[model samples]
Every structure is written in C-alpha cells, then in structure tokens.
Target chain A: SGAISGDSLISLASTGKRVSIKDLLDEKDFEIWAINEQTMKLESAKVSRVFMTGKKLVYILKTRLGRTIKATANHRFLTIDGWKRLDELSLKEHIALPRKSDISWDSIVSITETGVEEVFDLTVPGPHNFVANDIIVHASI
Target chain B: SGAISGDSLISLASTGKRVSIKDLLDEKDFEIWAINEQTMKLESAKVSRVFMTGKKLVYILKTRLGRTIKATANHRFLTIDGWKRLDELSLKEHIALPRKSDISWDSIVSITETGVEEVFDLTVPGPHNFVANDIIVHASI
Candidate 1:
C-alpha cells in the first residue's frame, strides 16, 4: 500500500553491492537478493518493475541496530509474527534484519514522518521482498 | 509453459502432509511449504491459483531416490546450474531435492513422456517454486 523513498538503500545481486533506489530508477530491469522470512536465508528474485511515485508522505523507521528506512506510511516490514505496515507496527515489536546464513532482529526506536518526498517501490517476482535500509521490506503493497 | 498431471504430489503446509494436485483442485486455496533453492530450506508460500488444463502431453522424470513427477515437457525443474525445462535437463546434472536443513542432489535416472494426460499448473506468487515428488520445481511457465 506504500512505497519507499527514492533515497533508500538495498542490496543488488546485479552489482554485488548496495545502491539507492533513487540511483537505480533508470537502470535496466535486474534481479535483487533478499532474506526469506520463513527460511531466514537470502535468495535472488526478478524485479517485476520499479516504482517512482513522485512526492508523497513517507514514514521513517529507525531501528536499534542503526538501521533506518524511509518508506510510504503503509509499507510493510517483516516481524516475528509476520509483515506489518510501518504505520501499524508497534514500536515494541522487532523487525527482521539480514544476517549471513540467518536473520537478526531489532526493535524500532523511532518512526518519523516526512511530509512529502520522492517515493519508490519495486515489484519483485516470492519472497517478494527486499532489504532496504538493511531491513526486510515487502515489495508488494 | 507446461503443467503437472493431476496425480503429482506436493507438500502442503496446512495439513502437514503430501497431497496430489488433482485431489487439491477442489480444496480451498491454501499455503504450501517448499524448498528455496537459494537457501535450501523450506518456507511456506501462498497459493495464487490452480490450473486444470485438459489433456496434454506430459513428461515424467524419476530420480534415484524413487521420486517421480508427471509434468508437461516444457516444465522447468531446478538443477545445480539453474532451472531447466524437463526436456532440456541433462541427466548428468543433479537436481536439487529436499533435506532437513539444506538441499540434496539427485540426478534423473529416467525421463519418459506421457502421450496425453490431464495437466495442472499453479500460479504461486518466489521463491516462485515448490517441491514436487520431492524435487524442486518452478511454478511459473
């Protein structure tokens, strides 16, 4: 239901390095690797398309691990129970983060809303999710 | 694009049991746990829809482990290199199979083509794949 801010970061299997969604908007369709909630392991998935929804309200979530993500207020993040929207997440719950061969958890320390900003999203073909701000975020709305 | 025969069996997360696609055609949509090639671990995924394509040509592949599947010739199965169409797979390459915490390798010992038979395909939204006859299979065309 929401998108990520263009400035958000994600790991790219294509480049074998991290890049901002803002920087990859114009690049050709490629694949991305992200952690699978059930397996707690990373897998590469095809990028269905990229989203560049002009300017819109976005929520910024900062985690205890120094991880932060600027995504649409409704963007979902994986938690111990399941995926929860940034706006719906209880600061008390832990969000899943990437770890080699496994996953780690961190709780939200703050959730700040930015008025209006360039927002982006990616539609990836299951584990339809990706690591943004070093956090596992669902690709589907 | 291909499909599996109604007799093909897959693991279901809901019942924690193995079932035939044919037997599940009328059952309400449910979730299935399958091997994620990237992680070699099992994860549950939502089932998008099911296909009941009428009589069609199907291919049968049997592994050393005594597992077998009846799928359309063009159906793809995961191998060490990547997902390869049943017809395209060389018996020399090992096909990925389910193991407790990881994947096991088993090469096809025989591949037989079923003249004409009922076919089925599942549109599961990636790891857009599932375990069939104990082997990893691509749910997509």
Candidate 2:
C-alpha cells in the first residue's frame, strides 16, 4: 500500500524522455534509481520489477517549482528531519531534493487526494528507495 | 534475498525477554521497532509479520562491546554520514549507535560469514527500519 500512483512521472529509460509509472507495467528490465536517496546523488539502477500492488488511496504532492507526484498516504519522502510518511507531513514541510551535485529543499505547496484509486509500488532491495516525479522516495512493499 | 539469519537476537516482545528473532516467527501481534533509525532514540513499534525471506549468506558483524548481528551482505545499516549496505561498508567504519539520548559511533571489528542459511525480513512502513541485535537496520521485502 506504500507506493505512488501509476500516473506519476518517473525519470527513467523510457521510450519518451519521461513516462508515467503505469506505462512500465509490462515493460521489462529498465533502469530505475537509488542514488538520489543514497548520498543525494542521482544514478540509474537497472531493475526487473514495477510491481502492481493493488489499489490504495492516493495523494498528490506539489512543490513551488511545479514538481508533482501522486502516491499513497503512507508513501515516504525524504525531508530535513528525515523520511516522513505523506500522512505525517504538514502543509508547509520541505522535501529534500537533489539539486545538481548537492541537496535542496522544495517547500510543499499542496497535498490533495481524490478518494481511493488504483496505485503502484516497487521493491528496491539494496537502497530501499527510488526517485518519483523528480523527488526522492523510499519504496518497497 | 536480503535478510538476516533467524538466529540473530532482536530486542522486542518475547516471553524470554531477549529472544532470537526466529523464536517469534509464528508469534503474532508483537512489538518491533523503527525509532532507532529515524531518531536513534530506541522507541518500540507494533508489527504483525516477521517474514521469512529464504536463504542468504549471512555475515556476523561485531563491535568492541560484543554487540553482534548476523545478516545478509546487502543489509543496510546507518552510519554518521548516512545509510550503507553491508557490502559497501569497510573494516573499521564507525557504525552509528544511539548512546543514552544522542548518537554515537561504534567502529567495526569484523564482518565474518559462516555459510548460506535461512533468513528473515520485515516491513516497517513509515521508518523502514528497526533495531536488530541492538544495532539499527533497514528492512523490507
């Protein structure tokens, strides 16, 4: 239940420069990421799965820079304080982002949800994370 | 593929006080932990599963104080800088430990492996971590 919506854009080796996570449902072995979460650096990781973990109530989080990601309420985002679940974050909390070679904080603008819906989740064993819609997200079952 | 040997001791709700993690494989609705990773403060958490993730080559890491934990090579641990997979950590690397209230460093003494064996894993949603063998560890499927 702790995953992003299929509609969220993820930076990866897709046919298009950027593609929705759902587009990869049947797309086999491709590069995802874990470096953004580990050392705050971006590096691509070749993974085999983009598991469909059933449906969940999803929330949309946006930043001042227009960056947005939709995920379940319990999905985690890295912040100054550490990893915080979407439900635990307040309106104005800052989410940690990788700006070039360093770390940056994009202040939260809004967090909206439109009831229960279908969602997606991924399992990253070593790093236990990946990037979603350009922001660092902790991922797994 | 990435979990600890069931023989490792975990600080949790057990009839024998400090029992091996394997002892609670069938024991349901017990307390685990996550605070030790997020804040390094050592708070307990309630969990329902201690999933058996099959066989893995488990390594034993010991400190000067006799604190030891046996786990797969890819298991993640916290350090002064950040989280590190067990395989990425070098000898003498200082592992972060919660001392009283704040954080402390416990330099590594050894990383020895006996052989491949059955191991276990857990899913801590928000924090993605727990204290195992008295040290902080990241867990998930």
User: All models: lDDT?
Assistant: 0.75, 0.69
What does candidate 1's lDDT look like per residue over A61-132, in tens digits? 777777888877678888888887775564456888887547888866556555688888888767788887
| Quality class of the docking in candidate 2, CAPRI style | incorrect
A4-122 per-residue lDDT for model 2 (tens digits): 88887666743326677788777756777566454667666665578778888677777767677887878888887788887666433688665655656987654555457778867
TM-score to true structure, per model: 0.48, 0.46
Clashing pairs in 2: none
Error of 2 at B78 (Å): 37
How many clashing pairs in candidate 1? 3
Q: What are the DockQ scores of the candidates, in order?
A: 0.01, 0.01
- Candidate 2 residue lDDT tens string, B1-141: 358889877667333256677886776556765565545576666665677888887777666566778878788788777877765554336776545455558866445545688888776666677767777788784
For candidate 1, list the clashing residue pairs, or say none. Answer: A1-A141, A126-B126, A126-B127
Model 2, C-alpha of A11: deviation from truth (Å) = 0.8
lDDT for B120 (candidate 1): 84
Error of 1 at A64 (Å): 0.4
